[PDB]
Enzyme design. Structure first.
Site, PDB file in Angstrom:
ATOM      1  CB  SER B 124       8.437 -18.178  23.102  1.00 60.71           C
ATOM      2  OG  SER B 124       7.326 -18.337  23.981  1.00 60.71           O
ATOM      3  CE1 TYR B 149       4.878 -15.230  20.068  1.00 64.23           C
ATOM      4  CE2 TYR B 149       4.386 -16.616  21.960  1.00 64.23           C
ATOM      5  CZ  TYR B 149       5.198 -15.683  21.339  1.00 64.23           C
ATOM      6  OH  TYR B 149       6.303 -15.189  21.986  1.00 64.23           O
ATOM      7  CE  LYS B 153       8.475 -15.690  19.130  1.00 62.08           C
ATOM      8  NZ  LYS B 153       9.248 -14.704  18.349  1.00 62.08           N
TER       9      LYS B 153
HETATM   10  N1  LIG Z   1       6.852 -12.526  27.418  1.00 66.42           N
HETATM   11  C1  LIG Z   1       7.309 -11.870  26.374  1.00 66.42           C
HETATM   12  O1  LIG Z   1       7.053 -10.667  26.215  1.00 66.42           O
HETATM   13  C2  LIG Z   1       8.112 -12.719  25.412  1.00 66.42           C
HETATM   14  C3  LIG Z   1       8.608 -13.987  25.815  1.00 66.42           C
HETATM   15  C4  LIG Z   1       9.268 -14.827  24.901  1.00 66.42           C
HETATM   16  C5  LIG Z   1       9.429 -14.336  23.592  1.00 66.42           C
HETATM   17  N2  LIG Z   1       8.992 -13.092  23.237  1.00 66.42           N
HETATM   18  C6  LIG Z   1       9.211 -12.633  21.881  1.00 66.42           C
HETATM   19  O2  LIG Z   1       9.895 -11.423  22.025  1.00 66.42           O
HETATM   20  C7  LIG Z   1       9.694 -10.546  20.924  1.00 66.42           C
HETATM   21  C8  LIG Z   1       9.453  -9.197  21.523  1.00 66.42           C
HETATM   22  O3  LIG Z   1       8.463  -9.288  22.604  1.00 66.42           O
HETATM   23  P1  LIG Z   1       7.974  -7.966  23.327  1.00 66.42           P
HETATM   24  O4  LIG Z   1       7.346  -8.457  24.579  1.00 66.42           O
HETATM   25  O5  LIG Z   1       9.004  -6.860  23.263  1.00 66.42           O
HETATM   26  O6  LIG Z   1       6.742  -7.506  22.408  1.00 66.42           O
HETATM   27  P2  LIG Z   1       6.537  -6.081  21.717  1.00 66.42           P
HETATM   28  O7  LIG Z   1       5.217  -6.077  20.977  1.00 66.42           O
HETATM   29  O8  LIG Z   1       6.714  -4.985  22.703  1.00 66.42           O
HETATM   30  O9  LIG Z   1       7.745  -6.015  20.692  1.00 66.42           O
HETATM   31  C9  LIG Z   1       7.703  -6.417  19.331  1.00 66.42           C
HETATM   32  C10 LIG Z   1       7.909  -5.204  18.424  1.00 66.42           C
HETATM   33  O10 LIG Z   1       7.837  -5.678  17.079  1.00 66.42           O
HETATM   34  C11 LIG Z   1       7.101  -4.726  16.304  1.00 66.42           C
HETATM   35  N3  LIG Z   1       6.725  -5.486  15.167  1.00 66.42           N
HETATM   36  C12 LIG Z   1       5.925  -6.586  15.169  1.00 66.42           C
HETATM   37  N4  LIG Z   1       5.820  -7.061  13.920  1.00 66.42           N
HETATM   38  C13 LIG Z   1       6.608  -6.319  13.124  1.00 66.42           C
HETATM   39  C14 LIG Z   1       6.960  -6.288  11.714  1.00 66.42           C
HETATM   40  N5  LIG Z   1       6.464  -7.205  10.865  1.00 66.42           N
HETATM   41  N6  LIG Z   1       7.772  -5.309  11.265  1.00 66.42           N
HETATM   42  C15 LIG Z   1       8.273  -4.373  12.073  1.00 66.42           C
HETATM   43  N7  LIG Z   1       7.962  -4.327  13.377  1.00 66.42           N
HETATM   44  C16 LIG Z   1       7.187  -5.265  13.945  1.00 66.42           C
HETATM   45  C17 LIG Z   1       6.030  -4.186  17.220  1.00 66.42           C
HETATM   46  O11 LIG Z   1       5.485  -2.980  16.708  1.00 66.42           O
HETATM   47  C18 LIG Z   1       6.839  -4.109  18.544  1.00 66.42           C
HETATM   48  O12 LIG Z   1       7.461  -2.845  18.833  1.00 66.42           O
HETATM   49  C19 LIG Z   1       8.517 -11.215  20.140  1.00 66.42           C
HETATM   50  O13 LIG Z   1       9.079 -11.882  19.016  1.00 66.42           O
HETATM   51  C20 LIG Z   1       7.956 -12.217  21.115  1.00 66.42           C
HETATM   52  O14 LIG Z   1       7.322 -13.368  20.554  1.00 66.42           O
HETATM   53  C21 LIG Z   1       8.324 -12.306  24.105  1.00 66.42           C
HETATM   54  C1  LIG Z   2       1.455 -11.054  25.028  1.00 68.96           C
HETATM   55  C2  LIG Z   2       2.654 -11.704  25.801  1.00 68.96           C
HETATM   56  O1  LIG Z   2       3.427 -10.988  26.461  1.00 68.96           O
HETATM   57  N1  LIG Z   2       2.878 -13.049  25.690  1.00 68.96           N
HETATM   58  C3  LIG Z   2       4.096 -13.762  26.232  1.00 68.96           C
HETATM   59  C4  LIG Z   2       4.069 -14.676  27.509  1.00 68.96           C
HETATM   60  O2  LIG Z   2       3.145 -15.788  27.488  1.00 68.96           O
HETATM   61  P1  LIG Z   2       1.947 -15.961  28.541  1.00 68.96           P
HETATM   62  O3  LIG Z   2       0.714 -16.392  27.737  1.00 68.96           O
HETATM   63  O4  LIG Z   2       2.308 -16.903  29.656  1.00 68.96           O
HETATM   64  O5  LIG Z   2       1.800 -14.477  29.168  1.00 68.96           O
HETATM   65  P2  LIG Z   2       0.498 -13.759  29.763  1.00 68.96           P
HETATM   66  O6  LIG Z   2       1.153 -12.577  30.405  1.00 68.96           O
HETATM   67  O7  LIG Z   2      -0.544 -13.508  28.686  1.00 68.96           O
HETATM   68  O8  LIG Z   2      -0.060 -14.857  30.780  1.00 68.96           O
HETATM   69  C5  LIG Z   2       0.631 -15.153  32.021  1.00 68.96           C
HETATM   70  C6  LIG Z   2      -0.385 -15.865  32.895  1.00 68.96           C
HETATM   71  O9  LIG Z   2      -1.423 -14.934  33.286  1.00 68.96           O
HETATM   72  C7  LIG Z   2      -2.731 -15.349  32.776  1.00 68.96           C
HETATM   73  N2  LIG Z   2      -3.364 -14.087  32.326  1.00 68.96           N
HETATM   74  C8  LIG Z   2      -2.842 -13.316  31.378  1.00 68.96           C
HETATM   75  C9  LIG Z   2      -3.396 -12.093  31.081  1.00 68.96           C
HETATM   76  C10 LIG Z   2      -4.536 -11.704  31.798  1.00 68.96           C
HETATM   77  O10 LIG Z   2      -5.088 -10.609  31.623  1.00 68.96           O
HETATM   78  N3  LIG Z   2      -4.984 -12.476  32.791  1.00 68.96           N
HETATM   79  C11 LIG Z   2      -4.445 -13.636  33.085  1.00 68.96           C
HETATM   80  O11 LIG Z   2      -4.935 -14.366  33.994  1.00 68.96           O
HETATM   81  C12 LIG Z   2      -2.444 -16.405  31.755  1.00 68.96           C
HETATM   82  O12 LIG Z   2      -3.535 -17.285  31.738  1.00 68.96           O
HETATM   83  C13 LIG Z   2      -1.092 -17.002  32.189  1.00 68.96           C
HETATM   84  O13 LIG Z   2      -1.253 -18.072  33.147  1.00 68.96           O
HETATM   85  O14 LIG Z   2       5.343 -15.355  27.731  1.00 68.96           O
HETATM   86  C14 LIG Z   2       5.770 -16.207  26.651  1.00 68.96           C
HETATM   87  C15 LIG Z   2       7.030 -17.009  26.942  1.00 68.96           C
HETATM   88  O15 LIG Z   2       6.482 -17.801  27.971  1.00 68.96           O
HETATM   89  C16 LIG Z   2       5.918 -15.316  25.444  1.00 68.96           C
HETATM   90  O16 LIG Z   2       6.269 -16.158  24.362  1.00 68.96           O
HETATM   91  C17 LIG Z   2       4.604 -14.603  25.122  1.00 68.96           C
HETATM   92  O17 LIG Z   2       4.871 -13.686  24.076  1.00 68.96           O
END
Ligand SMILES: NC(=O)c1ccc[n+]([C@@H]2O[C@H](COP(=O)([O-])OP(=O)(O)OC[C@H]3O[C@@H](n4cnc5c(N)ncnc54)[C@H](O)[C@@H]3O)[C@@H](O)[C@H]2O)c1
Ligand SMILES: CC(=O)N[C@H]1[C@@H](OP(=O)(O)OP(=O)(O)OC[C@H]2O[C@@H](n3ccc(=O)[nH]c3=O)[C@H](O)[C@@H]2O)O[C@H](CO)[C@@H](O)[C@@H]1O
Ligand SMILES: NC(=O)c1ccc[n+]([C@@H]2O[C@H](COP(=O)([O-])OP(=O)(O)OC[C@H]3O[C@@H](n4cnc5c(N)ncnc54)[C@H](O)[C@@H]3O)[C@@H](O)[C@H]2O)c1
Ligand SMILES: CC(=O)N[C@H]1[C@@H](OP(=O)(O)OP(=O)(O)OC[C@H]2O[C@@H](n3ccc(=O)[nH]c3=O)[C@H](O)[C@@H]2O)O[C@H](CO)[C@@H](O)[C@@H]1O
Ligand SMILES: [Mg+2]
Ligand SMILES: [Mg+2]
Ligand SMILES: [Mg+2]
Ligand SMILES: [Mg+2]
Lengths: 335, 335
Positions: B124, B149, B153
């Site tokens: 992340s 969080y 990571k």
């Molecule tokens: N912006 C983002 O969405 C983003 C960015 C960078 C990193 N990541 C990382 O990517 C991964 C996936 O993100 P995502 O957006 O698909 O979220 P997501 O919640 O859709 O996917 C994660 C999945 O893991 C499952 N899960 C969580 N904990 C578990 C456990 N202990 N055992 C089994 N299943 C479990 C949830 O039920 C879910 O389906 C996460 O590790 C997250 O930190 C996400």
């Molecule tokens: C739950 C989720 O998907 N989090 C991911 C997201 O972080 P991140 O925290 O940036 O993602 P968000 O989608 O929550 O936020 C994006 C931006 O929108 C703003 N915001 C968010 C939600 C809202 O309802 N209103 C609003 O204003 C936040 O302040 C931020 O500036 O990208 C990261 C990598 O960069 C990932 O590691 C995180 O897992």
């Protein structure tokens, strides 16, 4: 006041148990005996004339820890349970991170559930990595850890800080111990690891009484006056007394950080000489390669703990060596 | 080549599943459905015409993970299982550290036991904390994380690096994703969290189709041109393709680090406008206080991934918004 001591039958914990018991605290131990004997708790009881409530098992066992908290009214926790050998941690990172991080997380989950919110964490000079300055104060930056053990300690400190952020009714005390050595003056208790000792002074003690053959000195090419590693050794009884001082004086919310050391740094060869003076004869040693994870030199500025806790380490490297040697002479195979 | 995808029914995983399946890889999912539906895997199968072997449970369940590894011949693991909301992590640190650190540790213990030694970790941009420079490269220093969080990571990355130190026959790929958005062009699959979405674009999509009332914009006093947070949004299909590129091109030992983003930064208000252009009408929003853990601005230099993997994000913020809106229109309550 009731204190749960995790890793309660280990080296530092058993000395702490004594000092807590002698000040009228109640003590519960939980230990899996990975690196200790249940007999150490009999010796605690024998020295103090006081009970230790004994539980046998793993701090990562949530059902056990739930039982401990359900069966007792706990005010403070001292979390000593962990794996602690720097060199071993480099070769077995997952064993270290599992044991050390997850023990802490199961403990905290159960503590939260019972609203027990006062913890002393057994942290370590290893959090400073290669020290940005010497002597080290609580303002010296942490990080640059050189081995998974040290890393695990720094990770745990951050986890605990994050608990207080999420719930500032917590009292978190991060005690960064330097290198405890020595034994209780009675000679009824001391350092008794399972297997060959991973740390210096128990190995030195065993060689001095003829239980082991030769002190293995890990590296002679460090940037130190004699080329061997330099550490701040602290008498384990002084370190134990520090824990009692925390519980005597800190009854407020917050995160508190203290270095527990003497400020005196000794090389490996100077430790050997201290033991030779105590034994009255040479203690054979050999120069060996560096151990993975080891740094050249670390030692403490512990004046913050003196200021806030009224605590100072008094016992000298001679007291450390004599008491160690008294214990190991009376108990050559330990327990 | 068989790929175990932990968190296999989540947002990024299901898009990855498609891209892996379309290139002739075999896919196994393990998921506890904390933040996803099992129905998402039917849609993967429907889009690709290919199977996903489905296991239901927690990655922290060692007996389950032992069964998965005993019943299948796994070549690669992609570890998506985790909890991922920055703001929530500040309020629930232990839930985050338990879920995120211990899932990884049980996974690695079982992998080691079967000599499966190739992992892609879902890291992340949060590991960079407050970015020391913009755009961020894999040389930008990590640390100064602002929320548990992000901290979890960075801790996991170090744990994985320590695995390779202890056993350099490992292939460890740390993929630092920026902010994935969007949906598969079919509109049969997209982001479907449980409960109110914690991230921006699914919430924006739901408001646009009338499922939620008002976009909550967290803070307008950041040091950014319009005062709202700035993020590098990447189409989830491009991010999925990056995973396939890793497995296509990396078949050697070592630790490899890649930023997966576009290099384009958008403010919260600019995201809203992108969706308004896609919907053809205003999307109501309100300025709210800052969310704990949020930084002002982060965006990627992803040229390392282009160089070494032949991979680049092509899809634009309009593609992201249109595809999101297509999914949410066809599936207003998700699955
Ligand atoms: N912006 C983002 O969405 C983003 C960015 C960078 C990193 N990541 C990382 O990517 C991964 C996936 O993100 P995502 O957006 O698909 O979220 P997501 O919640 O859709 O996917 C994660 C999945 O893991 C499952 N899960 C969580 N904990 C578990 C456990 N202990 N055992 C089994 N299943 C479990 C949830 O039920 C879910 O389906 C996460 O590790 C997250 O930190 C996400
Ligand atoms: C739950 C989720 O998907 N989090 C991911 C997201 O972080 P991140 O925290 O940036 O993602 P968000 O989608 O929550 O936020 C994006 C931006 O929108 C703003 N915001 C968010 C939600 C809202 O309802 N209103 C609003 O204003 C936040 O302040 C931020 O500036 O990208 C990261 C990598 O960069 C990932 O590691 C995180 O897992
Ligand atoms: N120089 C030092 O000895 C020193 C310095 C700084 C910090 N510390 C920290 O102090 C603590 C105690 O050190 P020590 O020297 O007494 O070591 P020790 O091995 O004697 O004590 C630790 C005790 O914990 C037990 N234990 C370990 N993992 C456990 C688990 N998961 N469940 C239950 N019991 C468990 C062991 O069996 C042992 O009795 C450790 O956390 C260590 O990292 C030690
Ligand atoms: C197993 C153990 O108790 N480790 C503790 C010790 O670290 P530390 O690694 O310093 O303790 P050791 O007792 O293992 O080493 C002390 C010094 O002696 C050397 N050496 C050690 C053993 C040996 O047989 N020969 C030898 O030469 C080392 O290279 C080092 O310079 O203090 C730290 C706080 O600083 C604690 O966090 C560690 O838990
Ligand atoms: Mg000196
Ligand atoms: Mg004073
Ligand atoms: Mg821009
Ligand atoms: Mg190229």
């Amino acid at each position: 006041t009731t204190v749960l001591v995790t890793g309660g039958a280990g080296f530092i914990a058993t000395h702490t148990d004594i000092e807590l018991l002698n000040k009228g605290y109640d003590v519960i131990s939980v230990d899996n005996y990975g690196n200790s004997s249940p007999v150490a708790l009999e010796r605690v009881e024998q020295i103090t004339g006081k009970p230790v409530k004994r539980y046998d098992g793993d701090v990562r066992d949530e059902a056990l820890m739930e039982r401990v908290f359900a069966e007792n009214n706990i005010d403070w926790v001292i979390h000593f349970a962990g794996l602690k050998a720097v060199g071993e941690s480099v070769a077995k990172p997952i064993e270290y991170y599992d044991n050390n991080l997850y023990s802490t997380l199961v403990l905290l989950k159960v503590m939260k559930k019972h609203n027990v919110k006062k913890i002393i964490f057994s942290s370590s000079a290893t959090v400073y990595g290669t020290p940005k300055e010497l002597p080290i104060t609580e303002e010296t930056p942490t990080g640059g850890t050189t081995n998974p053990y040290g890393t695990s300690k720094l990770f745990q400190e951050q986890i605990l800080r994050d608990v207080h952020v999420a719930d500032p009714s917590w009292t978190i005390v991060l005690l960064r111990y330097f290198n405890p050595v020595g034994a209780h003056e009675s000679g009824l208790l001391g350092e008794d690891p399972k297997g060959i000792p991973a740390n210096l002074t128990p190995y030195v003690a065993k060689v001095a009484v003829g239980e082991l053959k030769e002190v293995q000195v890990y590296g002679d090419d460090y940037d130190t006056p004699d080329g061997t590693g330099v550490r701040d050794y602290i008498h384990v009884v002084d370190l134990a007394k520090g824990h009692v001082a925390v519980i005597d004086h800190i009854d407020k919310e917050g995160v508190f950080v203290y270095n527990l050391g003497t400020g005196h740094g000794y090389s490996v060869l100077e430790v050997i000489k201290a033991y030779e003076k105590a034994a009255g004869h040479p203690i054979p040693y050999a120069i060996k390669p560096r151990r993975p994870g080891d740094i050249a030199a670390c030692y403490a500025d512990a004046s913050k703990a003196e200021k806030e806790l009224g605590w100072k380490a008094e016992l000298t490297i001679d007291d450390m060596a004599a008491s160690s040697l008294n214990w190991q002479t009376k108990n050559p195979n330990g327990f």
